[PDB]
Design a protein around this nucleic acid. Structure first.
Lengths: 117, 112, 183, 88, 88, 100, 251
RNA sequence: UUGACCUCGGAUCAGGUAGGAGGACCCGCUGAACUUAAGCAUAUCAAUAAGCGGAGGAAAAGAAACCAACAGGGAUUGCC
RNA sequence: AAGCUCCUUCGACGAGUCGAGUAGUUUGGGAAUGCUGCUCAAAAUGGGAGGUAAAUUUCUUCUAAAGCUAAAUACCGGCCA
């Protein structure tokens, strides 16, 4: 299966350990700037679409406005205290709403919020 | 759901007069076979026998149709001087003839 | 709310009023040069919704391009060549957008909106000062305008697999043999 | 290159009618041509083919027309033969 | 599939399938009177007034390219006939 | 109410030819006394032959409705009529798409 | 007289051959073949899917057609055929499969375009009441009225309808005459070859009560759906096996 | 007579701006044939090479007229 | 100046653009996979895509023809190491 000019498009990954160090240093840089804050953002629990994977859950893009209000977190403050917000996802079932609301209350219990100035 | 009374009622509303005692064969030109084709088809996956069964059914209708039409006086045979359009173009039938040439050439070249 | 009335009027291009105006204006543009500056948009509603403001730094150049084909068909649009020719004449300006004004049977007429990046009004004002950055030089030449995006096929879905995120880049990605250290 | 006559190639229905076909390997009845009228029709076609291309439109029409009159006379003659044989 | 408790979701402002804006209908009706009619709509108007409703739909489809477009355009021009008679 | 399957005065098949000959070339029937068959199975005969002098006159001064085509129904040349010529004149100039 | 029919008794039949938006090239080839054999029918362009099924009635009322032959495609893969009498008559919905249109170079037959055919029906059409409704609808769609001025004078092909399985098999043959040995008819297939399985019969143009249901129709999507469920079932089986293996490994 | 407005011009007018180079990677246009296989032709090489235009430290894309048929996912990009 | 809450009041969303026909090219992709030229040329409980034999074209999911945006990605060229 080499009917094209494959030799001019061949990528060798000799920088695999070099890029890993670069990625690890970039993660350290984020911790340097956001010193007490985590380097990530809290993300919700979602169910995989297909019937092949619907028995398993994973992480979504951001929290729905309805489940953010049920937790007791204002919309405009959520991206500021380290919570991802997704305005495209709908709940459609109490099961998804309850799981992510409980996730938010667990996040609020562990939070240390400093005065503004 | 098989509403035989409703099905026959629907048929009566759109039925044309096809009775031979008052409607000549030229009007409808439809023939209903006396035997059942599936009774001559033991297995439906047998392509050779299935297509032979359909051909035989159509052959009888064409044979009976010709006899009735010629009795009534409707012309049947296409005259050799009647050139008219067909359902398949000249180019299509030229391709069909060429493929028959190619198969015959391959068969005869193999023997040679 | 005059622009909402103009939007509906521009929808009826074969109406008696619009046909009359387009007939007379087509003759007038034909007496003028192929590329000439228009002091004012002839479709103020269309220019406004494409990003035109009445500031110092916004200009309109209208241009007519010969229509037809090269049986070969140009992969870019007649609107793309109209923008590219106007940009060459006004080499100091940045092409923002363009719109159709008239067709005729020999030509095809467009009005092009251009922004001056070296004007203080544009530089101090946000919403337009992004065009002052050097990464926006000759967008019409690179297919970065609205016409170029349509021609390149930059849409999401299963009907645009081969051409979104770059057609040539996708081909290179699909035709590159990747060999790892631990095979 | 081999002749289509040598190969057992089925005849195809086209704008030119196949007509009533004859079974292979059987008696294809000889239809004799001996009338002066029947010979005239065949002769007109042969002469037209040999002449070929004629630049005059009227002269081309006349060549086609004489074949038409030859066909009409032959059809009339064969019709009269049928009537005489059918009646007498 | 699985049994989950369904939820009632808030109406989406992206829905354009509700009562459309009264102002845009006003603008469309006013502009249509001001602008006039296209040459092909003039043909349809003559056909509808003469009673050739069938020909009106066929001609409109040829110009537009869809049965639904032909139906809407014929209904729209029918209203103009009703109003113009009432206005006169 | 039921439909009456009739051809309105504006259908494509409102006026159908008597020749019962399709889109085939008229090169067939060139050497034949007849031109086509009707729907009853009877052959349509060629009408007549024009004079040679009339053909020369037509060649020198072409008739108004001359088209260069051959009528399938009757092998004589197809000529436009006055009403048809007005229709081509109206369309090619566009001044009057329809009267009144 | 606007009927374009010259006969003692006029059987005025006009057919509207209509296609939906998502038809394939093979489906269109089948439609073009059937339109050629129908001199009293006319072709019609793509029909809106979001519209209503009785909008076909005023569409056919627009063209003075009292028979509708409707081609409906799903997913760009499947074909469904509707036969209807436009104002009020019965309507039957089929699933068309095994399509072999013209221009396939293995038929070797031809016939006049518009010639009146011989309709060959099976004995099954005369017994089952629902097959008798389809027989009449077929006789109207492929009737080619006697005195029609677009038909051809001489008859040279036979259209045959057969019922072998729970399906209707449509074949088209050329009547070839051969001189007898001291004339007999030989048949050659010329045209479209397709199978119709009856789904439903409804009184009314494109609605009304259902008078027949197949109760054995296997949808092509049903075959597809089972294949997807099988792939998911295998994955769930492997996941369950791993969970049981982990539990027994702990034990 | 005077004065506005519109449109079009002059000026070595006051202040600016573009061209060229580079082109490894990037965005477009244009665009082959050797070669491979097959009665032939389409195909393959290749939506590549050559040619033209336009950027940057990255470029391009990008916040659904999307995927899905789910107990649903949720801008773009890249690896498996 | 700003966030929210409530409501006997309102709630504007992109046209020679979709689309139909046709020609060339292109894709694994005639529901035309996409693009371009030409002819015609729209809508507002609208429009696009998809699911569905399930009895009518019900149901699902988005909002095109205006625009900006770092990062993970490429790098035979530039300054070095």
């Amino acid at each position: 299966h080499f009917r094209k000019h494959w030799q001019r498009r061949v990528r060798c990954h000799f920088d695999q350990p070099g890029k890993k160090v670069t990625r690890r240093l970039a993660r350290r840089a984020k911790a340097a700037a956001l010193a007490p804050r985590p380097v990530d953002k809290l993300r919700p629990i979602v169910r995989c679409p297909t019937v092949k994977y619907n028995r398993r859950t994973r992480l979504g893009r951001g929290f729905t406005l309805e489940e953010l209000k049920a937790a007791g977190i204002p919309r405009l403050l959520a991206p500021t205290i380290g919570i991802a917000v997704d305005h495209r996802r709908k709940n459609l079932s109490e099961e998804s709403l309850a799981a992510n609301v409980q996730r938010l209350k667990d996040y609020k219990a562990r939070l240390i919020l400093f005065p503004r100035k | 759901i098989n509403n035989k009374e409703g099905l026959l009622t629907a048929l009566r509303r759109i039925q044309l007069d096809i009775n031979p005692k008052t409607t000549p064969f030229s009007f409808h030109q439809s023939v209903v076979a006396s035997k059942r084709t599936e009774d001559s088809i033991p297995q439906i996956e047998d392509d050779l026998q299935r297509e032979l069964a359909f051909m035989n059914q159509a052959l009888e209708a064409a044979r009976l149709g010709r006899s009735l039409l010629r009795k009534e006086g409707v012309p049947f045979t296409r005259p050799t001087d009647y050139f008219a359009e067909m359902v398949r173009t000249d180019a299509t039938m030229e391709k069909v003839k060429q493929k028959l040439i190619e198969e015959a050439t391959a068969k005869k070249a193999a023997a040679e | 709310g005059a622009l909402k009335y103009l939007e509906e009027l521009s929808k009826k291009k074969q109406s008696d009023v619009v046909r009359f105006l387009l007939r007379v204006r087509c003759w007038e543009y034909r007496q003028l040069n192929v590329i000439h500056r228009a002091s004012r948009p002839s479709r103020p509603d269309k220019a406004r919704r494409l990003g035109y403001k009445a500031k110092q730094g916004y200009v309109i150049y209208r241009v007519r391009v010969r229509r037809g084909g090269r049986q070969l068909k140009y992969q870019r649009s007649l609107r793309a060549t109209a923008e590219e020719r106007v940009g060459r004449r006004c080499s100091n300006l940045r092409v923002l957008n363009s719109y159709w004004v008239n067709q005729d049977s020999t030509y095809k007429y467009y009005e092009v909106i251009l922004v001056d990046p070296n004007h203080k009004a544009i530089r101090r004002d946000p919403r337009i000062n992004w065009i002052c950055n050097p990464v926006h030089k000759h967008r019409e030449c690179r297919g970065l305008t609205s016409t170029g995006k349509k021609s390149r096929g930059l849409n999401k879905g299963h009907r645009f697999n081969k051409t979104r995120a770059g057609r040539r880049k996708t081909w290179k990605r699909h035709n590159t043999l990747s060999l790892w250290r631990y095979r | 290159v081999y002749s289509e006559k040598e190969l057992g190639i089925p005849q195809l229905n086209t704008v030119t009618p196949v007509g009533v076909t004859k079974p292979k390997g059987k008696k294809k009845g000889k239809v004799f041509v001996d009338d002066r009228e029947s010979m005239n029709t065949i002769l007109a076609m042969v002469e037209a083919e040999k002449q070929g291309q004629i630049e005059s439109k009227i002269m081309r029409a006349r060549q086609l027309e004489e074949i038409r009159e030859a066909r009409r006379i032959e059809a009339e003659k064969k019709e009269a033969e049928r009537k005489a044989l059918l009646e007498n | 599939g699985h049994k989950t408790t369904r939820r009632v979701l808030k109406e989406r402002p992206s829905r354009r399938k509700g009562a459309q804006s009264k102002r845009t209908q006003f603008v469309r009706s006013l502009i249509r009177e001001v602008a006039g009619l296209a040459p092909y709509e003039r043909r349809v108007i003559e056909l509808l007034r003469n009673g050739k409703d069938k020909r009106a739909r066929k001609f409109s489809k040829k110009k537009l390219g869809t049965f639904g477009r032909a139906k809407r355009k014929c209904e729209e021009l029918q209203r103009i006939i009703a109003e113009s008679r009432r206005a006169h | 109410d039921e439909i009456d399957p009739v051809y309105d005065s504006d259908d494509t098949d409102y006026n159908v030819p008597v020749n019962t000959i399709g889109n085939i070339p008229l090169s067939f029937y060139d050497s034949y006394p007849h031109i086509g068959y009707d729907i009853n199975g009877k052959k349509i005969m060629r009408p007549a032959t024009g004079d040679a002098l009339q053909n020369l006159l037509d060649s020198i001064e072409v008739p108004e409705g001359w088209t260069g085509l051959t009528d399938p129904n009757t092998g004589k040349p197809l000529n436009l009529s006055r009403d048809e010529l007005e229709l081509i004149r109206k369309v090619q100039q566009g001044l009057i798409p329809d009267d009144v | 007289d606007r009927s374009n029919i010259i006969a003692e008794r006029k059987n005025k039949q006009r057919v509207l051959v209509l296609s939906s938006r998502g038809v394939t090239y093979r489906h269109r080839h089948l439609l073009n073949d059937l339109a050629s054999m129908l001199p009293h029918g006319r072709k019609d362009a793509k029909f809106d899917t979001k519209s209503r099924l009785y909008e076909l009635c005023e569409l056919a009322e627009l063209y003075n057609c009292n028979n509708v032959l409707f081609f409906e495609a799903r997913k760009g893969k499947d074909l469904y055929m509707w036969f209807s009498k436009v104002p009020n008559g019965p309507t039957v919905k089929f699933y068309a499969q095994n399509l072999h249109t013209m221009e396939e170079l293995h038929f070797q037959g031809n016939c006049l375009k518009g010639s009146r055919p011989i309709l060959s029906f099976d004995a099954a059409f005369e017994q089952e009441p629902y097959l008798k409704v389809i027989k009449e609808l077929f006789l109207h769609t492929f009737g080619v009225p006697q005195g029609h001025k677009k038909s051809k004078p001489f008859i040279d092909h036979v259209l045959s309808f057969s019922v072998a399985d729970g399906k209707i098999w449509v074949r088209n043959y050329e009547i070839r005459e051969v001189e007898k040995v001291k004339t007999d008819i030989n048949l050659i297939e010329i045209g479209p070859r397709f199978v119709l399985t009856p789904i439903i019969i409804q009184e009314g143009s494109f609605g009304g009560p259902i008078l027949y249901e197949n109760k054995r129709f296997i949808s092509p999507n049903k075959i597809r759906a089972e294949l997807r469920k099988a792939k998911a079932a295998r994955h769930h089986a492997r996941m369950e096996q791993q969970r049981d293996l982990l539990a027994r490994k702990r034990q």
